[PDB]
Amino acid sequence: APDREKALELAMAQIDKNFGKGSVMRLGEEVRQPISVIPTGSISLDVALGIGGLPRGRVIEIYGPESSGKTTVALHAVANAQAAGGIAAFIDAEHALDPEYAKKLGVDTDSLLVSQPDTGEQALEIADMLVRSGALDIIVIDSVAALVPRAEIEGEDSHVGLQARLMSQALRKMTGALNNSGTTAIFINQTTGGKALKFYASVRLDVRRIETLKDGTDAVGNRTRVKVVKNKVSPPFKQAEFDILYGQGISREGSLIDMGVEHGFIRKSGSWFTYEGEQLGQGKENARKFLLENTDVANEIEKKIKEKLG
C-alpha cells in the first residue's frame, strides 16, 4: 500500500532534480513560497496565480481579444513593481500607450523607460541588453505579433527566414539572463510567430472580456475573466474575475465585494450588502461606493480576506 505512494515520491522527486521544480505537480498541492513576486493589483488574480502575483525572473505571456484588459494588468504590474523602488521598461511596438491612463493606474511615467524599436530584431536586442544590466524589475513588450522581422518589412520568403525563429532565438538567450537578473518579463498577444513563447513562458494568462459592466446608467467599464492556462510555479488552471472601469482600471473595491461574499465576510440580505451588522448599500456598485470613501472598513475587509487565504 505505501510502496505505491512512496515509489511515486522517489520518482516524482527524481523528475524535479532533472527538469526543475514544477516539472510534476498535482492540482491539489499547496507546496509553496517564493518571496519574489509582483502583485498584479488584483487580489483575485493574485491567489489564482497561487504565489500571490507574477513570479520574478520568469517570462510571462498575457494573451487575448482586443480591449479585454491584458495591458491594464501589465500596467498595474508596472506600478506595483515600481512603487517598491522598481524600474520598469516598456518596449512599445504598437504606439498605443496612453500615459494619462497609465498615471491614473499608479505608474510613474516620468521615470518609465520607453523604447520604440523599428525592426523586430532591434526590439529583442534592446530588450535583451536592457535586461542584462540587471537593473530592471519588470519589462513589458506590447504586442508579440507586431514584432515583424527586418526582412518582412523590406522585401528580403513566402514564410521562411521567419518571425517564429526570431522569437525562438531572442527567447532562448534572453531566458537565461532573466534567471540571473531576476527581472520578470511580460509579453502581450492577440500561434503567430509564437509557438516558442508558449513553451518558454513559465506562466501564460488567457484574458477575456466576459460581461459589460454598467452602473445603472449604461457604461462604466467591464468584467474580465482570466484563466491561468500554464503555470510552472504553482498549480495551473485556476482562474479569476475582476472589474475594469473605463477610467480607473482594476477595481480594488469591487474585487473585495466579490471575495467578501465568496468568503462570507459580507452578507447578501437581498441586494443589500452588509458587513458586521452595518449595511454597505443596495447594488453591487453602490457598495463599492461605500467601500470607496470608508477606507478603514475596506482595509479590515481586505485584511481579513488576506488572512483567510495566505
Ligand SMILES: Nc1ncnc2c1ncn2[C@H]1C[C@H](O)[C@@H](COP(=O)(O)OP(=O)(O)OP(=O)(O)O)O1
Ligand atoms: N486610456 C484609457 N482610458 C480609459 N479606459 C481605457 C483606456 N485604455 C483602455 N481602457 C479601458 C477600455 C476597455 O474596455 C479596456 C481594455 O483594456 P486594455 O488594457 O486596453 O486591454 P488590452 O491591452 O489587453 O487589449 P488589446 O489586445 O486590444 O491591446 O480598458
